[PDB]
């Protein structure tokens, strides 16, 4: 069981398929929206620095 858990930990694809609980996907969407928001905030701040 421990070896299999290690293999799943290393196996990204099997984790992707297994972890499709729709809450993992909601968390991923929230995190990605936050990351794009941070990138957008930095980008907009730089734009205002350009004016």
């Amino acid at each position: 069981v421990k070896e299999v858990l290690e293999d799943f930990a290393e196996d990204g694809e099997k984790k992707i398929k297994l972890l499709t609980g729709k809450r993992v996907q909601l968390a991923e969407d929230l995190k990605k929206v936050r990351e794009i928001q941070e990138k957008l905030d930095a980008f907009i701040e730089a734009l205002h620095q350009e004016k």
């Binding site: 930095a42 980008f43 730089a46």
Partner: protein, 255 residues
């Protein structure tokens, strides 16, 4: 401190601080959002048109290096190819995720860029069709470049021949509308200049997605055929003036 200097203003705030970071914003949003419904605010330098040979040439006019797939008698641009343009040490380039630096003054590195692009296109496109929306990304620098992000999109066919899957034209239109439907995008229509203005395949699309002439710029390829009268000079003058467009247009330039 080194990250602050390199990832922010390394003496080039406009060209460096937020041009590559703009490309990162686009890449991260495209990673999160496969669709472009959320990319309306992010403009792009979009090149669209027919299978005209000058589609590669205009992109090398803006990205002033012979870095794009070149070919004859075929639509080489299978999939979108993104290039980030900015100033820097002359004739230097990068290929995303290839861990390789390219010298744009030597044929070997330009060929390497084109071959990597072709391989990524051949992996984006599945058997039975010629185009795929999946993107390819470059970072090109040089004194002749502006702070611009370019995308090299497949030419419109509207018809399928030679055993090609019938879905190809709809796939092409979807790939090109992903950007042409972007309110903030800039559309460059590549017009083959070997035919009369009456034959323009992409005019009807921008005339609906950009009827106000706020994004679409038409560029005439093979301008030497106006000198030779192979293409009607009168219609060429009228397209220069813009009398032949059933729409408003952002501008017009010669290729």
């Amino acid at each position: 401190v080194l990250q602050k200097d390199d990832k922010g203003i390394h003496h080039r705030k406009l060209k460096k601080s937020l041009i590559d970071m703009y490309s990162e914003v686009l890449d991260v949003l495209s990673d999160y959002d496969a669709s472009y419904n959320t990319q309306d605010h992010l403009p792009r330098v979009v090149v669209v048109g027919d299978q005209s040979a000058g589609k590669t040439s205009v992109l090398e006019m803006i990205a002033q290096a012979r870095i794009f797939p070149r070919g004859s008698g075929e639509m080489m641009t299978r999939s979108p190819v993104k290039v980030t343009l900015s100033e820097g040490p002359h004739h230097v380039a990068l290929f995303k995720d290839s861990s390789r630096e390219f010298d744009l003054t030597k044929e070997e590195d330009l060929a390497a860029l084109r071959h990597e692009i072709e391989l990524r296109m051949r992996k984006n496109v599945k058997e039975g069709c010629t185009v795929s929306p999946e993107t390819i990304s470059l970072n090109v620098k040089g004194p002749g470049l502006q702070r611009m992000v370019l995308v090299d999109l497949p030419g419109v066919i509207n018809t399928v021949t030679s055993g090609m899957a019938p879905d190809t034209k709809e796939t092409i239109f979807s790939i090109s509308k992903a950007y042409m439907q972007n309110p903030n995008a800039i559309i460059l229509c590549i017009q083959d200049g070997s035919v009369d203005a009456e034959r323009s395949i992409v005019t009807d699309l921008v005339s609906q997605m950009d009827p106000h002439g706020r994004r679409t710029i038409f560029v005439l390829t093979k301008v030497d055929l106006a000198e030779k009268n192979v293409a009607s000079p009168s219609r060429i003058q009228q397209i220069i003036e813009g009398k032949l467009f059933p729409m408003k247009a952002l501008g017009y330039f010669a290729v």
